[PDB]
Amino acid sequence: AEQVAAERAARKAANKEKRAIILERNAAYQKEYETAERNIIQAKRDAKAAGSYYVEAQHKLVFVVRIKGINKIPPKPRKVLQLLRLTRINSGTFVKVTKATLELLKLIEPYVAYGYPSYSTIRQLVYKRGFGKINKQRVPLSDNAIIEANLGKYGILSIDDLIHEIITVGPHFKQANNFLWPFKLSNPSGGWGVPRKFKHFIQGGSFGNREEFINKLVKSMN
């Protein structure tokens, strides 16, 4: 009476319940993303028609990549790179924008490329290079149940729940972002552009704020 035929079926029914919830969550998130972006486009249009200027809300998320190697770093940038968990070259981390962290990003400015990531790059980063931290031990995601086993207390059920909590900086961004292992990115597949990396992007190099060109960069590195 080991009840394999009914234990497997009850577990399958629970699996289908969870998948129904995940499906309706993702449909709600897709409608939310679409109405947010169309409302920003229409707000720009309506301000131009009124003669106003629509100023966008300032960006709340940057994606930081350490672009300089390990040797010859001064101790205060070295400490801040460890604190942002950028401990090797082409490491990446999502960063919530506050004053308390925009002054970290000014200290580590010659050693990192950052900017504002789009939904396409967050989606591709988390599907391809997304790893959790589970007793710590760097576990690949590849399953919604293992995401739910550590982030279900925060109401994060699936990988797209994780992506949504990253991109809309929710109340559990800190937990969802510290659960992700720092992204281990390759070199950019086309190159950096820029014959010399270690200038500012404004000055024709790589480091600093490259506000929305970080999407092109990280898609080449991913």
Partner 1 sequence: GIDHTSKQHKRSGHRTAPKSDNVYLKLLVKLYTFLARRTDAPFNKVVLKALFLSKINRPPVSVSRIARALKQEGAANKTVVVVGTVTDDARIFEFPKTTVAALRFTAGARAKIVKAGGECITLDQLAVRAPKGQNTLILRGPRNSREAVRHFGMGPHKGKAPRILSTGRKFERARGRRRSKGFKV
Partner 2 sequence: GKSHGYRSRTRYMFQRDFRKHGAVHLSTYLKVYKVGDIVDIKANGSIQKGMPHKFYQGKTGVVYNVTKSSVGVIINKMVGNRYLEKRLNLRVEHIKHSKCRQEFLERVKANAAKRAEAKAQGVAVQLKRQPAQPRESRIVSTEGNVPQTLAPVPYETFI
Partner 3 sequence: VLKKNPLKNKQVLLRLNPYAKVFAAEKLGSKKAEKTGTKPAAVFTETLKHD
Q: What span, in angstroms and rounded, lies between the C-alpha atoms of 179 and 147?
A: 9
User: Interacting stretch for partner 3, rule CB under 8 A, among 21-29, 60-68, 79-87, 174-182?
Assistant: 21-29
Q: Which CB atom, from 60 or from 216, has the smaller least distance to RNA?
A: 216
Decide: is 139 part of the binding site for partner 2 (CB under 8 A): no
> Do 87 and 80 touch, CB atoms closer than 8 A?
no
Q: What span, in angstroms and rounded, lies between the C-alpha atoms of 183 and 222?
A: 10
Decide: is 46 part of the binding site for partner 3 (CB under 8 A): yes
Angle value at C-alpha 117, between 143 and 222, nearest 5 degrees = 60
Partner in contact with 178, chosen from RNA, Mg ion, partner 2, none, beta carbon below 5 to 8 Å by kind: Mg ion
User: Interacting stretch for RNA, rule CB under 7 A, among 38-46, 53-61, 115-123, 180-188?
Assistant: 180-188
Decide: is 88 part of the binding site for RNA (CB under 7 A): yes
User: Interacting stretch for RNA, rule CB under 7 A, among 42-50, 146-154, 193-201, 209-217?
Assistant: 193-201
Strand order in the sheet with 183-184: 183-184, 91-96, 61-66, 112-114, 208-209
Decide: is 70 part of the binding site for RNA (CB under 7 A): yes
Q: What span, in angstroms and rounded, lies between the C-alpha atoms of 33 and 37?
A: 6
Q: What span, in angstroms and rounded, lies between the C-alpha atoms of 142 and 131?
A: 9
Binding site for partner 2 (CB under 8 A): 43, 47, 51-60, 97-101
Binding site for RNA (CB under 7 A): 68-75, 88-89, 136-140, 186-192, 194-198
